[PDB]
């Protein structure tokens, strides 16, 4: 985790050792599932590339630009999430349900 600060025109970057990040998986699928729309931001094909992580957003029922009564709002801080400092790591395992072979 790194803090960056501006002084006049110069930039400087320094480690912040005590800061955290928050990570959770939506195991229960309680969020709008935004994968599978073929959006950008996947891991690069070539392993030496460094990639930026895409911002999360979602769409809800609308009429014009306005929202209807069934429109839902989700606060992501309202799930349990693991908080990691620079020495922490995160892991989980997932098993695919039985699916027919893709026929190649």
């Amino acid at each position: 985790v790194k803090e960056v600060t501006q002084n006049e025109g110069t930039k400087t970057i320094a480690n912040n050792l005590t800061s955290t990040i928050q990570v959770f998986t939506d195991s229960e699928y309680q969020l709008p599932y935004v994968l599978g729309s073929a959006h950008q931001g996947c891991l690069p094909p070539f392993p030496a590339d460094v990639f930026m992580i895409p911002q999360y957003g979602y769409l809800t029922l609308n009429n014009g630009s306005q929202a209807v009564g069934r429109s839902s709002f989700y606060c992501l801080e309202y799930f349990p999430s693991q908080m990691l400092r620079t020495g922490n790591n995160f892991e989980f395992s997932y098993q695919f349900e039985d699916v027919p072979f893709h026929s190649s």
């Binding site: 229960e28 699928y29 309680q30 969020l31 599932y33 009564g69 069934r70 839902s72 606060c75 309202y78």
Partner: protein
């Protein structure tokens, strides 16, 4: 079913009921013809039906309030889903089953 419902290959069996015919006095000389004269008759009774239903509970991380089915707050000449002055039970409106939301 297109009217809505649960399609069942073996639905609840249909129950058939009939008053056993009771003949009026036959003639004293034999006749082959079937007896066309009966005692006018009817039956009454009680019927109980008990269905156990399985529920799928709503588990949702939606922050803002759902739409619910609620009765009208304002005053009225008579209560909805209740008898009137003459004793006639009436149902004001059809009540659909979907007020909750899920993510598609």
């Amino acid at each position: 079913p297109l009217m809505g419902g649960f399609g069942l290959k073996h639905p609840p069996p249909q129950i058939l009921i009939k008053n056993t015919p009771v003949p009026a006095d036959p003639p004293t000389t034999f006749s082959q013809a079937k007896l066309a004269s009966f005692i006018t008759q009817y039956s009454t009774g009680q019927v109980s039906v008990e269905i156990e239903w399985e529920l799928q509970k709503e588990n949702s991380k939606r922050w803002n309030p759902e739409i619910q089915y609620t009765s009208n707050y304002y005053k009225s000449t008579n209560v909805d889903f209740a008898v009137n002055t003459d004793g006639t039970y009436s149902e004001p409106r059809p009540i659909g089953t979907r007020y909750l939301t899920r993510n598609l």
